[PDB]
């Protein structure tokens, strides 16, 4: 199967300058392509996965991928399809983020063989480029009227928009020059990016022709949309980060389990490296069997193993099988650290708290008298087992939370009823 044919089978080609010439080029020889990533936070999230995965899909076919970290463009800010001005980050801020997201992109690509990936930083050439040379050597090739009519910023320019500063209005010049520079340095003849990068990609296509007299191509990936209209990574708990210390592999694994039946087969094509045929068998088995669909679990296993690793997937599976389980002895200290991060509503308690005190402190009851009914109804579980009396009282301390209930001397899973429960953390 062709490289382009594989991407269009997955619905991964949104816009491309010449699909026939790009397809014929990839079958005739191996090329170098590049994609740019701007440091806007201390870590990436799932909304950034498509471009770096698409780079890997090209590297699998023997092409050389270039991952550009925006050490310089991150100091300006991409205004493409943004209705409000981004704020300016400090040089110290961006330099740290450059090292962070660089450590997150490198695992996705191979650095062996002739097609080994290349990590680039546009601060290498902009960090020593004088402002006059910037405005002249780059700026003379840009028409302000053409810049104003770009869809990516036209909504900001109109009378209804919030306006744009000269800073962000100049961003397409930096990203445009990156394509010409990477074409000169590493023979980059293709730039891929997110769906909102069409304006800045074609700018680097034109600029590469004017500066290097070379024909290059651009391809944008689809906007990851959901069937119900909601945003892709918007969850109740926030964003689904790639850094395990921001979102636990359990919650990462949980996010992909909850994918809708309409979205799960497209997400398998977008994000996994299972073949179109393998995904086609997964879909047909679910569509023919009257049982629950298996695609969400397969999606969750593929994404957790890819981003976090095989052991972290095992941890997420072990937590998922133990959190609502009768026997929780499988949970480890690291498993509870995941739970305290974003697995369960965590609450700090100290020695001496009884059962009804923790039942209302965690929100599992409105009042203690209401929780006292839940206690005597045998509807309260501690680490999978119902609470038992263990005191000669003093009034409500008959059900006390003593050290026996402390998992690793720090954690206790408090459960009330069939659903909804909390995590106790001992200080
Ligand atoms: N504009 C891209 C980042 C980028 C930076 C430099 C480039 O050459 C290309 C792309 C983004 O907003 O995500």
Swiss-Prot record:
Q: Where is this motif: 'HIGH' region?
A: 39-48
Gene Ontology molecular function, alphabetical: ATP binding; RNA binding; tyrosine-tRNA ligase activity
Enzyme Commission number(s) from the entry: 6.1.1.1
- Positions with a binding annotation for ATP: 234
One Pfam family cited in the UniProt record for this chain: tRNA-synt_1b
Positions annotated to bind L-tyrosine? 34, 171, 175
Give the EC class as a word: ligase
Q: Give Gene Ontology CC terms.
A: cytosol
Q: Which gene encodes it?
A: tyrS
Supply the source organism for this entry: Neisseria gonorrhoeae (strain NCCP11945)
Its function, per the record, reads: Catalyzes the attachment of tyrosine to tRNA(Tyr) in a two-step reaction: tyrosine is first activated by ATP to form Tyr-AMP and then transferred to the acceptor end of tRNA(Tyr).
Cross-referenced HAMAP family, in alphabetical order? Tyr_tRNA_synth_type1
Q: What is the protein name stated in its UniProt record?
A: Tyrosine--tRNA ligase
Source superkingdom: Bacteria
Q: Which reaction does it catalyse?
A: tRNA(Tyr) + L-tyrosine + ATP = L-tyrosyl-tRNA(Tyr) + AMP + diphosphate + H(+)
Oligomer and partners: Homodimer.
Q: Which UniProt keywords apply?
A: Aminoacyl-tRNA synthetase, ATP-binding, Cytoplasm, Ligase, Nucleotide-binding, Protein biosynthesis, RNA-binding
What is a biological process (GO) this protein takes part in? Answer: tyrosyl-tRNA aminoacylation
């Amino acid at each position: 199967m062709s490289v382009i044919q594989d991407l269009q089978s997955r619905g991964l080609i949104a816009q491309t300058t010449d699909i026939e010439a790009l397809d014929a080029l990839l079958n005739e020889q191996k090329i170098a392509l590049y994609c740019g990533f701007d440091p806007t936070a201390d870590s990436l999230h799932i909304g950034h996965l498509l471009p770096v995965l698409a780079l890997r899909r090209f590297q699998q076919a023997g092409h050389t991928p270039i991952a550009l970290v925006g050490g310089a463009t991150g100091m300006i800010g991409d205004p493409s399809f943004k209705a409000a001005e981004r704020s300016l980050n400090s040089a110290e801020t961006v330099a740290g983020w450059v090292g962070s997201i660089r450590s997150q992109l490198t695992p996705f690509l191979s650095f062996e063989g002739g097609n080994a990936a290349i990590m680039a930083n546009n601060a290498d050439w902009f960090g020593s480029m004088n402002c006059l040379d910037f405005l002249r050597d780059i700026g003379k090739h840009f028409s302000v009227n053409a810049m104003l009519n770009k869809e990516s910023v036209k909504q900001r320019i109109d009378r209804d928009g919030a306006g744009i500063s000269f800073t962000e209005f100049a961003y397409s010049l930096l990203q445009g020059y990156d394509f010409a520079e990477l074409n000169k340095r590493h023979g980059a003849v293709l730039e891929i990016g997110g769906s909102d990068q069409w304006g800045n990609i074609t700018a680097g296509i034109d600029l590469t022709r004017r500066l290097n007299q070379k024909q290059v191509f651009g391809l944008t990936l689809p906007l990851v949309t959901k069937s119900d209209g909601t945003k892709f990574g918007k969850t109740e708990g926030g964003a689904v980060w790639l850094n395990a210390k921001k979102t636990s592999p359990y919650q990462f694994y949980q996010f992909w389990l909850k994918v809708a039946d309409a979205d799960v087969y497209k997400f398998l094509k977008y994000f996994t490296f299972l073949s179109i045929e393998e995904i086609g068998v997964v879909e047909a088995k679910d569509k023919a069997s009257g049982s629950k669909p298996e695609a969400q679990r397969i999606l969750a296993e593929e994404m957790t193993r890819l981003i976090h690793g095989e052991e972290a997937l095992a941890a997420a599976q072990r937590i998922s099988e133990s959190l609502f389980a009768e026997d929780q002895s499988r949970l480890t200290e690291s498993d509870f650290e995941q739970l305290a991060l974003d697995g369960l509503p965590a609450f700090e308690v100290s020695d001496g708290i009884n059962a009804v005190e923790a039942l209302v402190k965690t929100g599992l009851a409105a009042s203690n008298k209401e929780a006292r009914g839940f206690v005597n109804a045998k509807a309260v579980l501690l680490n999978g087992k119902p609470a038992e009396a263990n005191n000669p009282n003093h009034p409500d301390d008959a059900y006390l939370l003593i050290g026996e209930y402390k998992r690793f001397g720090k954690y206790t899973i408090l459960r009330r009823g069939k659903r909804n429960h909390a995590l106790l953390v001992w200080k």
